[PDB]
Amino acid sequence: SLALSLTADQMVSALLDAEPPILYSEYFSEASMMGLLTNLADRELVHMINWAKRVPGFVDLTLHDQVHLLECAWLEILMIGLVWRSMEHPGKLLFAPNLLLDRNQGKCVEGMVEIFDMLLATSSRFRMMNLQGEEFVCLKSIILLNSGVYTFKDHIHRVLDKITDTLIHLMAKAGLTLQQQHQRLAQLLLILSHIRHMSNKGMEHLYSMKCKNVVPLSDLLLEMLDAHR
Amino acid sequence: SLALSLTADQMVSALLDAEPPILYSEYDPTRPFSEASMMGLLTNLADRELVHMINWAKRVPGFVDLTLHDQVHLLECAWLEILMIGLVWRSMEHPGKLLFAPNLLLDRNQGKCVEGMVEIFDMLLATSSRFRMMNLQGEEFVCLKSIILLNSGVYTFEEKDHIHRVLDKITDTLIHLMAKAGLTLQQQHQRLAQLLLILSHIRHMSNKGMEHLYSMKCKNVVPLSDLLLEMLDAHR
Amino acid sequence: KILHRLLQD
Amino acid sequence: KILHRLLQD
Numbered sequence: 001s002l003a004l005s006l007t008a009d010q011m012v013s014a015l016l017d018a019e020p021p022i023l024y025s026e027y028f029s030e031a032s033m034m035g036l037l038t039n040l041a042d043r044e045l046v047h048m049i050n051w052a053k054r055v056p057g058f059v060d061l062t063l064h065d066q067v068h069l070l071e072c073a074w075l076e077i078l079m080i081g082l083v084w085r086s087m088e089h090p091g092k093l094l095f096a097p098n099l100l101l102d103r104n105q106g107k108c109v110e111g112m113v114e115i116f117d118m119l120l121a122t123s124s125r126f127r128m129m130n131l132q133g134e135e136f137v138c139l140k141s142i143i144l145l146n147s148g149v150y151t152f153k154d155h156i157h158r159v160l161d162k163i164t165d166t167l168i169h170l171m172a173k174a175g176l177t178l179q180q181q182h183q184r185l186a187q188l189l190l191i192l193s194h195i196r197h198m199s200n201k202g203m204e205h206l207y208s209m210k211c212k213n214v215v216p217l218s219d220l221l222l223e224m225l226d227a228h229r
Numbered sequence: 230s231l232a233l234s235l236t237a238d239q240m241v242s243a244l245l246d247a248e249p250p251i252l253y254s255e256y257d258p259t260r261p262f263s264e265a266s267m268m269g270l271l272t273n274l275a276d277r278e279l280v281h282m283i284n285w286a287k288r289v290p291g292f293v294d295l296t297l298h299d300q301v302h303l304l305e306c307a308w309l310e311i312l313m314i315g316l317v318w319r320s321m322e323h324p325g326k327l328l329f330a331p332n333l334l335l336d337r338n339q340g341k342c343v344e345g346m347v348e349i350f351d352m353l354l355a356t357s358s359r360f361r362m363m364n365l366q367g368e369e370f371v372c373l374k375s376i377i378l379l380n381s382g383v384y385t386f387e388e389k390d391h392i393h394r395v396l397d398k399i400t401d402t403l404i405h406l407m408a409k410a411g412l413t414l415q416q417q418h419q420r421l422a423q424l425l426l427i428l429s430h431i432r433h434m435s436n437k438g439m440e441h442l443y444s445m446k447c448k449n450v451v452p453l454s455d456l457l458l459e460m461l462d463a464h465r
Numbered sequence: 466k467i468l469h470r471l472l473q474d
Numbered sequence: 475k476i477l478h479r480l481l482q483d
């Protein structure tokens with residue numbers, strides 16, 4: 001492999017360089033709301049897929065395995081990105097620089113306000129923990145490799161260990177004690193359980209909007225949805 | 230507070246003695262298994278397990294401190310997670326099989342008796358294989374199950390501080406176990422990561438399991454108990 | 466709720 | 475799949 005030979009600083013810099021851009025929304029009705037989000041997330045998916053190939057160890061996997069991991073974690077990846085963008089905008093969600101929404105606006109779509117609150121709560125957790133960008137890109141890569149790893153693998157677990165070592169190295173650099181290192185590592189990884197939860201609630205809600213045909217969904221998004229069913 | 234003052238050993242011992250018993254099913258194994266009968270056995274089993282779980286939760290260090298409303302909230306959110314990780318733990322030394330009860334051991338073939346269940350069976354089995362591969366210890370298991378209880382509903386939420394404090398304590402406990410086991414600091418971090426990443430999958434199985442229960446309910450296959458309907462009406 | 470009653474006693 | 479193409483592409 002090529003990921004395992006890397007050092008902690010090389011891993012971070014590689015992930016930082018692989019970071020997708022922050023896209024803009026096309027310049028609120030229930031249909032207009034879902035329309036903006038669908039269009040935005042659709043374009044985000046394309047950048048995510050190319051970001052995934054720049055994740056150390058992901059390219060080593062077979063095509064079918066790469067597909068499986070992305071189908072499983074794509075909404076988790078989108079959400080943790082959203083939460084990260086909205087970190088210094090408390091009470092608000094930064095879907096795009098020209099699209100900053102608060103919980104009130106989430107009420108324009110039925111069942112969405114619950115997901116919004118979960119997203120806002122995650123953002124407050126990142127803010128309270130004072131999450132670093134170097135830590136963020138590690139967590140996002142962990143989600144990609146881990147979320148669908150048990151629906152299949154020693155290679156993926158090897159990379160996951162490397163990202164764990166990478167995380168710890170970042171905390172040691174910040175001057176955190178060993179006790180503070182384990183504890184914050186635990187705090188970070190426990191959030192992934194909630195991000196998974198938000199993804200599943202969001203996945204069902206997307207299927208809901210799909211059924212009501214509130215807006216027509218893209219071929220790509222419908223493919224990702226038909227993987228969780 | 231009582232939880233914060235405990236050491237790692239007193240933490241483990243408290244959790245180990247708080248462990249609920251392994252219940253039996255009413256499986257009279259001359260019946261082949263109907264989709265209704267299968268769901269009937271599992272529901273009756275899980276319903277009796279819920280009662281023991283509630284009293285187990287009250288013995289989890291720090292849980293007693295919380296308000297009733299928070300107690301209710303944490304249990305409503307994590308009850309299926311607790312059931313599933315308990316099931317997976319029971320089925321650890323039974324490869325390709327799920328030990329719902331000592332008199333109820335099922336492989337994925339029998340899981341096909343219920344529509345939409347064999348997918349959940351395979352996930353539970355894969356989790357069991359992972360526990361087996363990691364050589365998971367009982368001391369680590371009781372820590373993980375307690376982590377699930379306190380963490381799963383903490384971001385749906387004044388004093389979220391106390392919950393995080395106990396979580397940090399259980400984290401310290403897990404590290405101490407790996408240290409005494411002779412694992413290096415690198416191995417301690419990695420194993421800690423591997424364990425906590427399982428909880429993401431346990432959350433997933435619970436959510437897929439939660440939806441499948443709402444299916445069986447509206448499909449009227451086998452009627453659910455009043456307690457189970459309460460737990461489901463808290464999760465959509 | 467049964468859960469509240471069982472949590473009480 | 476569109477996913478296959480994008481991953482290849």
Ligand SMILES: O/N=C/c1c(O)ccc(-c2ccc(O)cc2)c1-c1ccc(O)cc1
Binds near residue numbers: 039078115116202209
């Ligand atoms: O049905 N629920 C949809 C939803 C939600 O409830 C909360 C957040 C999102 C979303 C949108 C864009 C992102 O970059 C991240 C999350 C979404 C979302 C996800 C995918 C879409 O194509 C459109 C919207």
Ligand SMILES: O/N=C/c1c(O)ccc(-c2ccc(O)cc2)c1-c1ccc(O)cc1
Binds near residue numbers: 273276316442445
């Ligand atoms: O609809 N699917 C239900 C299911 C499943 O797919 C997989 C495992 C379980 C289960 C049963 C008993 C336990 O102690 C833990 C999990 C269950 C389960 C959960 C709750 C019940 O009341 C009955 C069965």
